[PDB]
Design a protein around this motif. Structure first.
Motif, PDB file in Angstrom:
ATOM      1  N   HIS A   9       0.845  -1.188   0.000  1.00 55.57           N
ATOM      2  CA  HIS A   9       0.000   0.000   0.000  1.00 55.57           C
ATOM      3  C   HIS A   9       0.881   1.238   0.000  1.00 55.57           C
ATOM      4  O   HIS A   9       1.830   1.322   0.782  1.00 55.57           O
ATOM      5  N   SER A  10       0.557   2.193  -0.868  1.00 56.93           N
ATOM      6  CA  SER A  10       1.252   3.469  -0.942  1.00 56.93           C
ATOM      7  C   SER A  10       0.228   4.592  -1.000  1.00 56.93           C
ATOM      8  O   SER A  10      -0.868   4.425  -1.541  1.00 56.93           O
ATOM      9  N   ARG A  11       0.594   5.741  -0.440  1.00 60.13           N
ATOM     10  CA  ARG A  11      -0.301   6.886  -0.367  1.00 60.13           C
ATOM     11  C   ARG A  11       0.399   8.135  -0.874  1.00 60.13           C
ATOM     12  O   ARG A  11       1.579   8.353  -0.593  1.00 60.13           O
ATOM     13  N   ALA A  12      -0.337   8.949  -1.633  1.00 63.45           N
ATOM     14  CA  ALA A  12       0.162  10.247  -2.088  1.00 63.45           C
ATOM     15  C   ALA A  12      -1.047  11.173  -2.234  1.00 63.45           C
ATOM     16  O   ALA A  12      -1.702  11.197  -3.279  1.00 63.45           O
ATOM     17  N   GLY A  14      -4.207  11.417  -0.577  1.00 65.87           N
ATOM     18  CA  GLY A  14      -5.497  10.783  -0.700  1.00 65.87           C
ATOM     19  C   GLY A  14      -6.544  11.418   0.193  1.00 65.87           C
ATOM     20  O   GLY A  14      -6.442  12.586   0.579  1.00 65.87           O
ATOM     21  N   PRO A  15      -7.579  10.654   0.535  1.00 64.82           N
ATOM     22  CA  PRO A  15      -8.633  11.181   1.411  1.00 64.82           C
ATOM     23  C   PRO A  15      -8.129  11.444   2.822  1.00 64.82           C
ATOM     24  O   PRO A  15      -7.169  10.829   3.292  1.00 64.82           O
ATOM     25  N   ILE A  16      -8.802  12.372   3.500  1.00 68.27           N
ATOM     26  CA  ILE A  16      -8.454  12.770   4.856  1.00 68.27           C
ATOM     27  C   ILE A  16      -9.683  12.627   5.745  1.00 68.27           C
ATOM     28  O   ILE A  16     -10.820  12.574   5.272  1.00 68.27           O
ATOM     29  N   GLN A  17      -9.436  12.566   7.052  1.00 72.98           N
ATOM     30  CA  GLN A  17     -10.508  12.410   8.023  1.00 72.98           C
ATOM     31  C   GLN A  17     -11.356  13.681   8.092  1.00 72.98           C
ATOM     32  O   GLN A  17     -11.057  14.702   7.466  1.00 72.98           O
ATOM     33  N   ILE A  18     -12.430  13.614   8.872  1.00 70.84           N
ATOM     34  CA  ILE A  18     -13.364  14.724   9.001  1.00 70.84           C
ATOM     35  C   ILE A  18     -13.161  15.488  10.303  1.00 70.84           C
ATOM     36  O   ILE A  18     -13.311  16.710  10.333  1.00 70.84           O
ATOM     37  N   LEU A  19     -12.811  14.797  11.392  1.00 75.12           N
ATOM     38  CA  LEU A  19     -12.571  15.495  12.650  1.00 75.12           C
ATOM     39  C   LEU A  19     -11.268  16.280  12.598  1.00 75.12           C
ATOM     40  O   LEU A  19     -11.214  17.436  13.030  1.00 75.12           O
ATOM     41  N   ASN A  20     -10.213  15.667  12.074  1.00 72.03           N
ATOM     42  CA  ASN A  20      -8.950  16.342  11.824  1.00 72.03           C
ATOM     43  C   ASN A  20      -8.550  16.099  10.379  1.00 72.03           C
ATOM     44  O   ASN A  20      -8.803  15.023   9.830  1.00 72.03           O
ATOM     45  N   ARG A  21      -7.928  17.099   9.762  1.00 67.19           N
ATOM     46  CA  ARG A  21      -7.566  16.986   8.357  1.00 67.19           C
ATOM     47  C   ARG A  21      -6.279  16.187   8.209  1.00 67.19           C
ATOM     48  O   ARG A  21      -5.324  16.640   7.568  1.00 67.19           O
ATOM     49  N   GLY A  26      -5.761   2.715   7.266  1.00 68.41           N
ATOM     50  CA  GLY A  26      -5.989   1.458   6.566  1.00 68.41           C
ATOM     51  C   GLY A  26      -5.869   1.505   5.061  1.00 68.41           C
ATOM     52  O   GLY A  26      -6.492   2.345   4.410  1.00 68.41           O
ATOM     53  N   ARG A  27      -5.064   0.597   4.502  1.00 57.91           N
ATOM     54  CA  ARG A  27      -4.942   0.518   3.051  1.00 57.91           C
ATOM     55  C   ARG A  27      -6.300   0.419   2.372  1.00 57.91           C
ATOM     56  O   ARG A  27      -6.441   0.830   1.215  1.00 57.91           O
ATOM     57  N   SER A  28      -7.301  -0.134   3.061  1.00 53.37           N
ATOM     58  CA  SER A  28      -8.627  -0.249   2.466  1.00 53.37           C
ATOM     59  C   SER A  28      -9.241   1.117   2.203  1.00 53.37           C
ATOM     60  O   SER A  28     -10.036   1.271   1.269  1.00 53.37           O
ATOM     61  N   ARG A  29      -8.885   2.117   3.006  1.00 60.91           N
ATOM     62  CA  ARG A  29      -9.361   3.481   2.834  1.00 60.91           C
ATOM     63  C   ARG A  29      -8.298   4.397   2.242  1.00 60.91           C
ATOM     64  O   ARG A  29      -8.451   5.621   2.298  1.00 60.91           O
ATOM     65  N   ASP A  30      -7.228   3.830   1.681  1.00 62.02           N
ATOM     66  CA  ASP A  30      -6.125   4.597   1.099  1.00 62.02           C
ATOM     67  C   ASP A  30      -5.499   5.539   2.124  1.00 62.02           C
ATOM     68  O   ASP A  30      -5.169   6.687   1.821  1.00 62.02           O
ATOM     69  N   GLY A  31      -5.333   5.049   3.350  1.00 67.05           N
ATOM     70  CA  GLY A  31      -4.755   5.851   4.403  1.00 67.05           C
ATOM     71  C   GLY A  31      -3.252   5.694   4.513  1.00 67.05           C
ATOM     72  O   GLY A  31      -2.688   4.646   4.208  1.00 67.05           O
ATOM     73  N   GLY A  32      -2.602   6.761   4.969  1.00 71.71           N
ATOM     74  CA  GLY A  32      -1.161   6.780   5.080  1.00 71.71           C
ATOM     75  C   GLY A  32      -0.655   6.090   6.328  1.00 71.71           C
ATOM     76  O   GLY A  32      -1.410   5.621   7.178  1.00 71.71           O
TER      77      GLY A  32
END
Length: 62
Positions: A9-12, A14-21, A26-32
């Motif tokens: 899994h690699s991230r560049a 991608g999506p960010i959370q809502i409470l904190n940016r 999790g790789r399933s959510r494309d998280g770093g």
DNA sequence: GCTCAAGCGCTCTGCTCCTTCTCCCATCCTCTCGATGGCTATGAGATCAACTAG
């Protein structure tokens, strides 16, 4: 059952959370990856202030 | 019978014991399973501030 194809899994920017940016989780959510307290600790021991700022501020949640 | 004493209760720490209270318990990563989540109407009065004419 440990096939590498389900562990890579690699991230560049991608999506960010809502409470904190901050990047998602999790790789399933494309998280770093998490640059945690021990990682900041080792970078402190290194002395890489600019890299620490880039990791914790610039590349996480400017 | 005239002054040093003997006590004396009251207060001030203080000393230890017992009790009570807040925090704390490695990092990162993957996946699934479950729970959750709200959705009265319709009409009546009455005010008010902005158009639309005058």
């Amino acid at each position: 059952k440990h096939m590498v194809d389900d562990k890579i899994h690699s991230r560049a920017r991608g999506p960010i959370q809502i409470l904190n940016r901050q990047p998602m989780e999790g790789r399933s959510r494309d998280g770093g990856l998490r640059f945690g307290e021990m990682e900041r600790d080792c970078q402190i021991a290194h002395g890489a202030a600019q890299f620490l700022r880039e990791r914790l501020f610039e590349a996480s949640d400017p």
